[PDB]
Structure formats: C-alpha cells, structure tokens
Amino acid sequence: MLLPWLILIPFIGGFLCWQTERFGVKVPRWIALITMGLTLALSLQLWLQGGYSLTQSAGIPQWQSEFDMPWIPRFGISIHLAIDGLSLLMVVLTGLLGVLAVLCSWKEIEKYQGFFHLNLMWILGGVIGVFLAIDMFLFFFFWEMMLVPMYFLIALWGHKASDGKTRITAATKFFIYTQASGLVMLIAILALVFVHYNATGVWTFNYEELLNTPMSSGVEYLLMLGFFIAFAVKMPVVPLHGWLPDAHSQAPTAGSVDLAGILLKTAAYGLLRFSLPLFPNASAEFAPIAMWLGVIGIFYGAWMAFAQTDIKRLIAYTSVSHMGFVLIAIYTGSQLAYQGAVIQMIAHGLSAAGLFILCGQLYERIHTRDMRMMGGLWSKMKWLPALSLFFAVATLGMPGTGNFVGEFMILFGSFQVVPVITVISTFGLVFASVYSLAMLHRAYFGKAKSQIASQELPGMSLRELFMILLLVVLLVLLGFYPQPILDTSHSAIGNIQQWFVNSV
Template identity: 40%
Template sequence: MESFPYLSVAILFPIAAAFLIPFLPDPGDGSRIRWYALTISLADFLVTVAGFLNGYDPSVDGLQLVEQVRWLPELGLGWSVGADGLSMPLILLTTFITSLAILAAWPVTFKPRLFHMLMLAMCGGQVAVFAVQDMLLFFLAWELELIPVYLLLAIWGGKKRQYAATKFILYTAGSSLFILVVGLAMGFQGDGPPSFAYGDIAAKPLGLSFQALCYSGLLIAFGVKLPVVPLHTWLPDAHGEATAPVHMLLAGILLKMGGYALLRFNAQMLPEAHAQFAPLLVVLGVVNIIYAALTSFAQRNLKRKIAYSSISHMGFVLIGVASFSPLATSGAMLQMISHGLIGASLFFLVGATYDRTHTLMLDEMGGVGQQMRKMFALWTTCSLASLALPGMSGFVAELMVFVGFATSDAYSLVFRVVIVSMAAVGVILTPIYLLSMLREIFFGQENQNLLEHNRLRDAEPREIYIISCLLVPIISIGLYPRLTTETYRATIETLVQQNRSALVVSTGIPPSPVPPALATAILPDGIPSLSPLATQ
C-alpha cells in the first residue's frame, strides 16, 4: 500500500485552496474569507505534522517521504519531493508560522480576498522550496514565493511600499538567475541524459574549478535571501513597509530559505568548493553579527531596528555552516528554527504596537508601560528570547555555534580565537539595544500628545494567544533542545562527515582530532552530544 503523499498535499493544497477564494461568498467585510484561510492553513499544518509523525524517522539520515512522478525523462523533468533533517523541521516551521500569520491578519479589511489568496499561495511555495528534490523545481518554487511577497508589500505596505517592493523584487529575482544558470550547468554536466535531481547532481564527478564557479553563483543568490552583508539592504526597507503578517513570514520563513539552501547546495552538493570558501563564510558571518548589531543600535525606527537585529542573528548561521563541526552546524540549524519563532514574535508585536501608537519612531514613544502592561510583558519576554537569555532557544543555538566553532579542528587556534572574540561583541551589543528599546517604548519621558490622542488599549486575547503559541516552542527548546535537535541530528552528522572528507581532499592536510569529551563536557544536559568526527 502506497503511503499518503503528505508533502505533495502540503504544497498543492494551499495553492489550490487559494484559487477558490474568488468564488467564495462573503458579506464584504472579509469575515468568511479569514476563517476559510485560517482553516486551510491549520489543515496544512496538520498535514505536515501527520507526515512527520507517520512517515519520518529522525534517526535516518537519508531522504524520506519521497514522491516522484516522471514527466519528461528525456530532459530530466519530473515532480520529486522528499524530506530529511535539513528540510523537515523547516517545513513544520513554515506551516506553523503561516497559520499564526493568517490569524495575525485578522484586522485586514482592504481587499481581503486577494490578501489571503496571496498568503495561502506563498505557504505552498515556501513548503515547496524546502521539500522539492530537483534543481528546476527548486528554482520555480523560489520564484513562486517572490510574487506574493511583492504584491503584499506593494499593495498593503506603508508610504514607501512601492520603493520597498521594487527593491525586493530586483534583489531577489535578479539573484535568482544565478540559481537557474547554476542548476542548468550542473544538470547538463556529464554524459547521458540531463538530470536535475539533487542526488544525481551530487553523484556527478564535478571538478573543483566547476564547483567553485557554481558555489560563487549560489552564494550570491542565497546571500541575498539570508541576507549577507552587503547584499542585505532590501531587508530593512521591506520590513520598514510591510504589515505584521508579512513581517512574520519574512522573518520567520523567508530568511531561513537562504540558510537552508546554503546547507543543501553549497555544503552538501559542492563539498570541495565549500572547503575552499568556508573561511570566507566565517568572516562574512562575523561581519553580519557586528555590523548589523551596530546598525540596529543606531536605528530610531522600530521596524528597522528589529530588521537589523535579524541580520545580526543570521550571522551565526553562516559561522555554523562553515565550521566543519557537527555541534556548530547543528547550532546553525537550531538558530534558523529559533530565529524563525523569535523574529515572528517580535515583528508581530511591532505591528500591534504601531496599531496603537500610530508611530514607529522611538523618539515619539515613551511612558506607555502603565497603560499597556500585558503588551509590556509580551515585549519583554520576546526581547529576552532574542538576546539569548538562558532558558530560551536562542541561547542554546548561539552557545552550540560558539562552542562548536571554538573546538573545530578545521581552523587554526588563532583564527578561532579571533572569530569567537569578535562574534562575542555582537552578543554583548544585542541586550544593550534591545533593553534600551524597551525602555524607550514603555518607560522614559511620557509623550503627552501620544497619550492624549490615542487610546492605548492593552493586548487583546488574540494577540496574547499568538505570542503564547510562539513562546511555547521557544521556551521548550531552550529547556530541552533535544526535542528539536534529534529531528535532524543524523543528517547533520552525515553532512559534516562529508564536508570533513572534502576538506582533507581539498587541502591535503588532515585536521587534528579534537578530544570527543571537549564539546560535551561544557554543555548542559539536553544538548546533543555531537562529538567531532574522525578524519576520513
């Protein structure tokens, strides 16, 4: 008996449901459309959960939930989806965040049909990015999710929405051309009929020069999406004009597509080139952490401050990906999941605060803590999660990256000390600008004009529910990380073993083994004991 096509349904169901929205009866206020979209997104989330529980084995490092349909074998075209440790956690994150984003869009009354149609279509496209196992399908899915984001920015954004939407599409669509060119080059490489399947491409004997060219093109494409400084400038503008539900999708899912793609393509499919480019990724990661943290510190616009904070946190993903350490690479994966939850919560609170104060400038806020005590509690909890408070998911993820890279034998001791010391600067700056932000919003000198002309209502039950849904996994992961890390541990260990073997081939110098107990002795119970792998 064939298994249920969980991934195909998770991709196609919300897209098909989106095209039914124009035909649904609605009194005109969008009330039925909202409930319809929420029901579809929740059903899609349950489909992915069912696939995880019934068809996914975390202890297996290979591809699972595989579904293939040959369309045109002569050109290597077909439908191919599957999930492993790199994709399954992000698929679950996508459907979870999308459901909460649609609930966050409850106040949207302007063109509700089109809005929710785009939200559902984007959900299917983002799941496809993580699930497809074919380069051409990946490119199509990557492009599919760009269209809804562009329209959501251009139609429902702020005063500079056209500028932000245009900049977003120019950066992301332009960089996507590198994916198409590299995909075609790798698909047609070698003898025999072309094949764009990930497994077939990874099995091809690609030369180091060819790998380096492909790696460079993909690094640009995925560096824009992550984003990597200096390819980041579209993100603050996009966040500065987006609405709260779109914020949640941008911070919670869109940025993770870049990190996932770096692991899937650059690290997994081009291992020898990855061995050459890894030090560059580490340096770029440190630049991300420090530059974005300093820039966030100087921002007076609340949305842009959180946007630069997101860029800073994604720097840890770059360091972990390039660490050649299973502990740090596992930390990079956990950082993507953790930041998806924390970033979505912070940007939702930004939107909720703007709805009350009608301003994003910190200079125009102040003294609202007495009138919005529940909102202050929510802001404080989510900000503490973002600054990596122990007991929260961000602390575990960053600790794993720090310790994993510090104990990695792929780099010299001097290089590791310099990188860890510089990255620590960003960790120090983060609580400074986040706690200062809280002080300026809720305390400080009261803005009498703001207090007199705005009825600053406190957090509503719907808003508390959304933040609670995000805080439950944030705290759960912080207290017992193995809940999440075990879902991808086998895949990460195999990937790092492959990268370390490529490092030996590329440099000819086998890295010295690190004592297995070193990485585990200083970590609390609950963090996976991923000891460094022996040199192949």
C-alpha cells in the same frame, strides 16, 4: 505520498477563498484558519508517524517520504518532492507561522480580502515547496514564484495606493535584488548540469546524480560562488542585504512575518542542503571568506541596530546580526555546530515573529511609528510591554530561550574547528544586549509625557494575547528542552557533515 498534497493545500485554499468571495466576505478568514490547520496536521503527522530518530549513517540519500513525477521529460525535470528530518522541522515552523499570519489578519475586512488571502496562501505554499525540493529546477521554480506574490503585498497593501514610497523603493529593491541572483544560480545550475552531461551523457536535473559529478578543480569554484550569491541575497549577508529593512518597515506586519520568520530560513536551508554537498572542495576553499563575512555581519547588524530610531527597521537589523552565526556554523566541519544552527534558526523565526506582531500591535494602538517619540507606556498598557520585554530578552542569548542554546553550540563547534575567528564572534552577545536595551528603554521605560498621544490608550483583545502567549511558552520549552528536535535532525546533519568531511 503526502508531499504533493502538503504543497498544494495553500494553492487550493487561495482558489476557494477567492471563489467564496462572491458568496461572503467573512468566509476567507475562517476558511484560511482551517486550511492552515490541515497543513500543520499533515506536517505533525509526518513528525509523529515517521521514524524521526532514524539511522545516523544511512548515506546522503535518506527520506521518510518521497514523491516522483515526470514534469518535463526532455531534461528529466521531475516533481521530486522528498522530505528529510530537518526539512520537516522547516515545514512545521511555516505551518505555525501561517497560522499566526492568518490570525493577525483576522478582523481585517477591506474592499477586497479574498485577493489578499489567495496571495497569502500562495506565498506560504511557495516556501513549503522550496523546503521540499530535491530536483534543481523544481527548487528554482518554487524559489522564484514565492517571490512574485510578496511584491503585490507590499504594493497594494503596503499602503492603498496613496504614497509612492511603498512601491518604487521598498518593493522594487525587494524584487530586483532577489531575481538577479536567482538567475545567477540558474545559470550555475545549468553549468553544473552541462559538465555532468559531458561526463556521463544524460540530461538530468536530479540531486542524487548531480551530487557526485566529476569536475576539474578551478571550475566548480565559480559555480559555488554562483550558488552562494542567490543564497546570500535571501538571508541577509554583508554585501547584499539592503532590501530587508525596507521590506519589513513597509509591508503589513503579517507580510513581515512571512518576510522575516520564514523567507530567511530557505537560504541557509539551501546552504546546508544544495551548496555544501555538491561542492565540497570549492566550499573548503571558500570557507575563510565565509567566516570573515559572518563576523562582519554580526558586528555590522548590531551597530546599525543601535543607531536606528524606528522599530520595524530595528528588528529588521537584528535579523542580519542573527544570521551571521548561522553562516559561520554552516561553513565549518562540526556536527554540533550544524545542530546548533538548526535550533538557532527555529528560535530565530519564533523570536522575530512575536516582536513583529507586537510592533504592529503597538502602532495600531498609538498610531505612531517612531520609537523615540513615545516612552513610558508601561503605566498605560497592561500586557503588551511585559510580553514584549521577554521577547526582547529572548533576542539575545538569555537561557531558557532557544536563542541561547542555538548561538552557543555554534560557538562550541566553531572553537572546535578554528580558534581565532570564533573568539572575535562571541562579542556580538555584548552588542546584542546594547540594542536590546536600547529598544526596551526608548520604547517603554520613561514618562508618558514624552508624547501627547501617549495619554489615551486602547485595550488588548483576547486572541492576540492567546497567540502571543503560545509563542512565549513554545519558545521557553525550546530553550529548556531542545532534545526532541535535535534527535530529529541528527541523521540529516550527520550525513551532510560526513560527506563534507570524506569528500575533501
């Protein structure tokens, strides 16, 4: 019921901001803040009003709210929006990140600003629609239309048409690397539906009847690779992640909040929801390749993070290290491991968003991007580097932050299922420390005479500090007290694991 409205407010707000662009220029900032407030209101209403602590073994079909509507009846394509417990965590996270995106874009007036915000709400609404998606075509359409408006963001707002490096390399690799694999998973969807159409005799694009379709061995394996390729180019996996640092280092850091904190979520959401239950034996065969790619991703991202000299590419290469833990979590037979991935995933978004906001904040203070050029700014800034120290501290497994409990319950479940690949995996924490300290010492520890421009520094406004203070206190409560959201996700995680166990 609430789901059609909850995916449509982003699109309605873009229309109204661009409508009132003719009326005024200070309107869309204040319009956008209220519209994202309504998005979190409906999302938090579903958290509180709904039975978040529901039955742990109520089957694979279980939803607090559900919407159905005929869209293309010839294939049974329907607007099958349906919200689960873990999907509701995703919706509340993106509503909060949308508030941060529209708050960081405050006091940013240009030649056109309504165009920026209709695009801003369009891309955030696309991610919400992926998170509420049970029909395969609706899932794919939303997956691919959140991908078009970021291209305009990197192009027309990466820099205003002055340098050609903001389109022809950064934005173009971002677009092609995702869309080729999106078309791969579309033909994977179609091969799965056609083998189901031979089995039963109805053209259906719905998840519940495609869940248990009879397929011979050696056939569903190729479709599982087809799903995983599109789910491995969106979250950074080892062979195909070259788009991520270019995308984050060129887009404005509000666009980078969208590009890191929430676009990385949807691929592991799809690995939990759409790839694991549909292909149980194929995923059981593919598991060790996934573990090898996971350990390679953690070690690889940390080394590339240590070796880099700038900051946006630095945090962009932390992200590929973080997601390796999540991939190994998903491809195991443990309930605790999956519940560790969820808390690690929410904390991943919350620990990347603050760093990107602050890295963009530091650049507009000093007008210099290279990290090794500055140094010793602690005597000049009064609140930026202290808050930045805790966010770099929250990146690695420091307890009292959500990242520690996240990565570390994965390791418990991972050692429960398989010893040797887990005992390799744990060493990324040592490597997490070295790139964390490298960031901290090269940027803030030292003498302010490392740069001439490090001798005249501005002040920090109240609202940026307010939205940084909220994230640090929110992230500490998730580290100390993670029970409420684990009780929320228990049943959804449990039935996925029980199906992955029982179907093999």
